Design a protein around this ligand. Structure first.
Ligand SMILES: CC1=C(/C=C/C(C)=C/C=C/C(C)=C/C=O)C(C)(C)CCC1
Ligand SMILES: CCCCCCCCCCCCCCCC
Ligand SMILES: CCCCCCCCCCCC
Ligand SMILES: CCCCCCCCCCCC
Ligand SMILES: CCCCCCCCCCCC
Ligand SMILES: CCCCCCCCCCCC
Ligand SMILES: CCCCCCCCCCCC
Ligand SMILES: CCCCCCCCCCCC
Ligand SMILES: CCCCCCCCCCCC
Ligand SMILES: CCCCCCCCCC
Ligand SMILES: CCCCCCCCCC
Ligand SMILES: CCCCCCCCCC
Ligand SMILES: CCCCCCCCCC
Ligand SMILES: CCCCCCCCC
Length: 226
């Protein structure tokens, strides 16, 4: 009875339902281009379902000493994000036909974001937790910069309906993603202001929006068809 359990349970349910809905729709499509978007986009909440379920059952949680106390850190979030965040970037890349080398650079940056975020989360010297946070946030900002300036440029060579879908998904991504570093800084991993139960609520809202919300928008569009 960690009080955050309720949001881990709701997160589990929403990621599950979203995965099932997307699989059902995905299995029914025959267009090859649309299939690739369905495969990527169904896997996103499926992974998140597995990690939410794991946390709900008490796995992916460790205690890290800093600031003179033992602090609960959910590390399973990073195992989700490691794979889900680049898959979302891959959906955006495929929509705008990004260059292969831009994709690699973004996936690289994304692994740096998640891996330095996790190192920060497990670091025992309080000050140095923020150093890793800042490196992670830099990597995130590079990603957003590229999505905002580079991908929008590529998108403008596409038909308007593809460009328009990309722009909504870009906007969703920039708003949601930019919130994660702030939650971490003020929550249990950082300054310890916002209690773990509220923090789990906030990451559940963000996660569901960034995966299922995003997917609803992408998979209902005409832009994914060939
Ligand atoms: C910058 C930054 C972070 C960014 C996380 C992001 C952007 C998560 C996105 C999650 C999604 C889209 C889930 C689905 C962390 C790792 C919290 C750690 C501290 C700094
Ligand atoms: C040659 C121009 C280089 C531009 C340098 C920008 C550095 C700071 C970027 C901070 C990220 C902003 C993200 C924008 C996303 C909406
Ligand atoms: C206590 C919170 C968990 C709620 C679980 C709901 C499970 C799926 C509901 C299906 C209804 C559409
Ligand atoms: C219920 C779990 C579903 C996850 C399916 C997504 C994976 C797509 C693989 C690509 C098909 C060859
Ligand atoms: C083709 C490029 C491969 C890896 C690129 C990494 C991009 C910069 C990350 C900034 C982190 C602070
Ligand atoms: C007392 C020591 C000063 C601490 C330095 C803080 C620097 C903030 C820079 C943030 C980089 C993104
Ligand atoms: C002891 C004085 C240290 C003050 C450092 C402040 C400058 C932070 C630089 C961050 C640049 C990104
Ligand atoms: C609209 C944002 C409201 C921010 C709430 C501030 C949290 C203050 C905590 C006081 C510590 C006991
Ligand atoms: C035990 C909890 C005491 C502090 C309450 C602060 C709540 C912060 C929520 C801010 C939302 C952004
Ligand atoms: C004590 C109440 C236990 C109920 C657990 C419900 C979680 C279900 C996830 C769908
Ligand atoms: C929603 C589709 C089912 C995903 C199966 C994976 C379950 C592993 C949880 C530990
Ligand atoms: C007190 C330690 C500060 C050193 C942090 C330097 C990190 C820059 C790497 C990108
Ligand atoms: C301490 C109670 C205040 C927290 C409310 C947080 C609202 C988040 C909704 C997305
Ligand atoms: C990915 C770059 C690693 C830089 C490490 C700085 C941490 C020193 C406390």
């Amino acid at each position: 009875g960690r009080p955050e359990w309720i949001w881990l349970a709701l997160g589990t349910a929403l990621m599950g339902l979203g995965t099932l809905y997307f699989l059902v729709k995905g299995m029914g499509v025959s267009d090859p281009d649309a299939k690739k978007f369905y495969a990527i986009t169904t896997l996103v909440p499926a992974i998140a379902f597995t990690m939410y379920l794991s946390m709900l059952l008490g796995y992916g949680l460790t205690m890290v000493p800093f600031g003179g106390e033992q602090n609960p850190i959910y590390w399973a979030r990073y195992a989700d994000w490691l794979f889900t965040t680049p898959l979302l970037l891959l959906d955006l890349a495929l929509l705008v036909d990004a260059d292969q080398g831009t994709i690699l650079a973004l996936v690289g940056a994304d692994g740096i974001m998640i891996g330095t975020g996790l190192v920060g989360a497990l670091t025992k010297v309080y000050s140095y937790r923020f150093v890793w946070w800042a490196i992670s946030t830099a990597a995130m900002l590079y990603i957003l910069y590229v999505l905002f300036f580079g991908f929008t440029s590529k998108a403008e060579s596409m038909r308007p309906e593809v460009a328009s879908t990309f722009k909504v998904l870009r906007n969703v991504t920039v708003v949601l993603w930019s919130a994660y570093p702030v939650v971490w800084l003020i929550g249990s991993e950082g300054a310890g202001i916002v209690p773990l139960n509220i923090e789990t609520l906030l990451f559940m809202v963000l996660d569901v929006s960034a995966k299922v919300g995003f997917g609803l928008i992408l998979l209902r569009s005409r832009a994914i068809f060939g």
